Amino acid sequence: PKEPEQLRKLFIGGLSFETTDESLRSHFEQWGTLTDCVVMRDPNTKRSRGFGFVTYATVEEVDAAMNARPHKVDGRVVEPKRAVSHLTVKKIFVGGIKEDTEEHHLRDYFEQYGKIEVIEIMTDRGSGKKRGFAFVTFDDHDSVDKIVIQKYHTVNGHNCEVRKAL
Numbered sequence: 001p002k003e004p005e006q007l008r009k010l011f012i013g014g015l016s017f018e019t020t021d022e023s024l025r026s027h028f029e030q031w032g033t034l035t036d037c038v039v040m041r042d043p044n045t046k047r048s049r050g051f052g053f054v055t056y057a058t059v060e061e062v063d064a065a066m067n068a069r070p071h072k073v074d075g076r077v078v079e080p081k082r083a084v085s086h087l088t089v090k091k092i093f094v095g096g097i098k099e100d101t102e103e104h105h106l107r108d109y110f111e112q113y114g115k116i117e118v119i120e121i122m123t124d125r126g127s128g129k130k131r132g133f134a135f136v137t138f139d140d141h142d143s144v145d146k147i148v149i150q151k152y153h154t155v156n157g158h159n160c161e162v163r164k165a166l
């Protein structure tokens with residue numbers, strides 16, 4: 001049962017114009033089996049457009065490649081991002097957590113997606129009561145990208161709504 005191809009793709013921006021299908025593949029094959037690897041080029045001049053994409057055999061291989069950033073490919077630090085579901089942000093909205101969810105509930109769950117920098121449990125401006133939603137800020141966008149493509153998030157027994165924030 002193969003994961004959907006879209007979830008196995010990495011868009012690589014910031015390429016050296018000298019990077020080729022072959023040199024992009026040789027680099028990113030260090031972190032998994034590549035079923036596809038393409039440098040985008042102008043149709044007339046064949047000059048690189050400065051970006052391309054690689055497709056791994058599994059999502060765990062995508063994770064391995066992202067965890068090995070920064071990637072210097074043919075002498076240039078490139079910018080890998082998971083394919084769109086790009087709104088590149090480090091913060092999520094977490095809704096549906098009700099009044100009994102605390103900081104440690106959110107931390108213990110979300111810390112396995114990435115390094116957390118801020119947890120903000122929202123409270124009512126007048127009463128101080130919890131409003132039932134929170135924001136979590138990570139040190140990097142790939143955490144958010146992994147989070148929002150999941151169908152489900154269960155935190156503190158609550159089925160939560162999670163979206164990219166701002």
Ligand SMILES: CC(C)c1ncc(Cl)c(C(N)=O)n1
Binds near residue numbers: 163164
């Ligand atoms: C009131 C709820 C719907 C809300 N407030 C703020 C944000 Cl930033 C989001 C979101 N989906 O990102 N959702």
